[PDB]
A paper describes a structure:
For marine invertebrates with no adaptive immune system, ferritin is a major intracellular iron‐storage protein with a critical role in innate immunity.
Subtle structural differences in the putative nucleation sites suggest possible routes of metal ion movement in the protein shells. However, the marked variation in the electrostatic potential of the threefold channels in Fer147 and the fourfold channels in PeFer suggests significant diversity between Fer147 and PeFer in terms of metal ion aggregation and cation exclusion.
Numbering used by the authors:
A (entry chain A), B (entry chain A), C (entry chain A), D (entry chain A), E (entry chain A), F (entry chain A): 2 to 173
């Protein structure tokens, strides 16, 4: 029995939105782990803390954008376990930014794959929605992380990392 | 002799925009009929009146969005009779909301069909225009009507219908 | 079974209000056709566009004044097809103003005929209502269109039409 | 090698804070599931939606209070999988409030158990911290849910549930 | 060695963005030539001057939108000579507006061709970006130039051209 | 047939102004290339980006100052191809500032050479105009670039370049 709103919305698209929901929540958890790693007394970079804390809140917003979309189209949210991140510790500011870029590139591919499911099933509204909410925001996030990685390599460790935290990440 | 602006704009697309203009004007007329039905002394629901009056004005705005688009692309507006609605009377608030949802789903399909004409003829700008102006607005309208139908069934007839008119539709 | 409000309201008057509703909606559609004709890239007169767009919205307001009146007196709105206008194209600014005047004079007669139905059936309130809402507004509209026609003949075609659009119709 | 801040902070307390972090994140996920269930077109209670959405954000704040505390005391955050909730669907507003109360009572016990670990290990600051941040907030949350359950039983299903959503939960 | 941001970005798309950069800069130079032609003591139309000066600045902004896009996607800007325009002199206001429309239609085709390269290579983000930034803006620019050409033919040479400069182009 | 304004304005001066127009536009293009090089994900210096972007806009303003001057004196603007810059890549912040200084010194000589043409032909107004608009502005630009080069050598590569971008160029 099809939900009352449902029109031009395919079971593969509905299932793909649930898979993207879990990935956004997973990315939220990775950024949360990194945020609180930078609050450790033996790491102590408030800029990096604030940056990954905000990244974590944004990913949970992405998850909730997809939950609202699922309900708009008359699909049904199915939640899965949010897997713990692969590491308890995240190294230097540079190493954490590289992990961030690799995560954002994996989320980007997964969004393009979900756009392909929409396209395969003739879902013109879902393709446009993914384009409006996600595809350009992911390009912007990937360029920003690439800029940060270039600058963290330019400033180098020690004082450089500290000044990057103060200047680019507005630490404090 | 092609109009001065005309570029990548197919006769099938031009004709499809005229057909969508008439459908938007038709939907405007159905909502107008329902609006003034709720102003009857023997129906007397100001919330429902205000809701369908606004829906009617929006559909005429949709019609005028398509008239402006036709002229932008160098096509020519051709108007047809606006058929009277299928009923003089529209029953209960619940029955009118169900008629609304069925109308919005028929307008939605017709917009996806017009997007398919654009796509078939390689009209990338017209596909994006339909996506920006219509496809997401239709999804939102269909979800809102589905929410209203669920709530009108929850509150039930009599006092429930009255309180829905006061609370959700801000009657008065 | 007479509606609860109904007092001194004759079946001929009720039927005449439904006929005037359709005529107001028809006039609305003619003005809408002319409005969007003046938005064509090959006509391109923003003053004329704005003038007929406003005329169109006013005629739909007239239609809704009569719908409210029908319900006030305990009559029942019966909607008919809104016939498409007699032309797709409307010529020069002067030619469109002459079509406007001829339409307003036909709506005026039809209002005087409806006033005669009210009078024949002793409906003192309906005669006064038509006088308050319509008869003087029609005289004003006819005088304004006659003034515009005189001025469009004075300024002549080409630059004159352009300056009339800028000065009298406040184009832009 | 003990972290630089660490003083009077026992391995059992550190491990108990990580277990409470996962429970707060779990409760956050249950409230998130319930929030978006109430946004379904076939459930459509904006008050319940807003209430569980806020409850979800608060539980994630609780999780982050414990992450900050772990780092303050020189312990180390260890994250585990956030288990999916036990249900995809949550029934009536009344049924969801009862699930909420049962969850808050299980989180409450778990906080008293964590306070007992602190007490067993002579951690006077950690006992006071749990008292300041959690023990009274849990009593308040449990009393509020008990009040809501009493009122949802008083108003009854259908119109009652709708009016509770409008009046007590400020729906819209 | 692929740049750090690069994902789903094809060499044909990168090369097409460099070709569109040069075309936008070329169009900027044509509008600049026309702007300063209208500042000649023997042409002296401040409205036309201001209009083509703004058109020139906008085209250079288009060029810079594509430079930012190239860098966002991890491609590399390659600049070519900006060819001088085909004429030193641009005739009447009407003749310059017709040259403008022909230029905007050639830039429009070139944007649709670049969208086709994006589409051929499955670049969903680049297609949406071209749609958001360019395809509708080009339709609007072409309709405006078509409107101006219609009006410059309506007003005729001499006084008409002067009044068009004062009224539509706000000369001074 | 001499233009109506022309007085004491020599063909050599008119031709020299057209040559300076092309040089200013060339310098604009070099600064634009350098601006967008500093926006590359693998260069990523917002201060340098903003500095060369502004330098580029100023050089195009210089070009337009000379176009206005040509028309004031009754000469005729003749535009040539704007040659692409000699490099796609511009190295370190220090290397780009040295390229800037060398460009500004070549533009300076070319302005003194144009002043000599004015002087040779007794054009007292054109000599004063070049003095007022250009000769002191070039001295100021050359001193500023020399100061920046001294400071980029003082701070050294890596962190020094980053801090120069933040402090002297107000990056962000
Ligand atoms: Mg995300
Ligand atoms: Mg794809
Ligand atoms: Mg699209
Ligand atoms: Mg868009
Ligand atoms: Mg519509
Ligand atoms: Mg389709
Ligand atoms: Mg009327
Ligand atoms: Mg009479
Ligand atoms: Mg009176
Ligand atoms: Mg909690
Ligand atoms: Mg105890
Ligand atoms: Mg352009
Ligand atoms: Mg195409
Ligand atoms: Mg210069
Ligand atoms: Mg000298
Ligand atoms: Mg001097």
């Amino acid at each position: 029995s099809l939900s009352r709103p449902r029109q031009n919305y395919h079971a593969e698209s509905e299932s793909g939105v649930n898979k993207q929901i879990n990935l956004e929540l997973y990315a939220s958890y990775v950024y949360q782990s990194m945020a609180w790693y930078f609050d450790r007394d033996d790491v102590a970079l408030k800029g990096f803390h604030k940056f990954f804390k905000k990244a974590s809140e944004e990913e949970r917003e992405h998850a909730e954008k997809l939950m609202k979309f699922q309900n708009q189209r008359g699909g049904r949210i199915v939640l899965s376990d949010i897997k713990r991140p692969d590491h308890d510790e995240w190294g230097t500011g540079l190493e954490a930014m590289e992990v961030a870029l690799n995560l954002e590139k994996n989320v980007n591919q997964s969004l393009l794959d979900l756009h392909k499911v929409a396209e395969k099933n003739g879902d013109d509204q879902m393709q446009d929605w993914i384009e409006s909410h996600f595809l350009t925001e992911q390009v912007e996030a990937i360029k920003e992380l690439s800029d940060h990685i270039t600058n963290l390599k330019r400033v180098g460790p020690g004082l450089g990392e500290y000044m990057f935290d103060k200047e680019t990440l507005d630490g404090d």
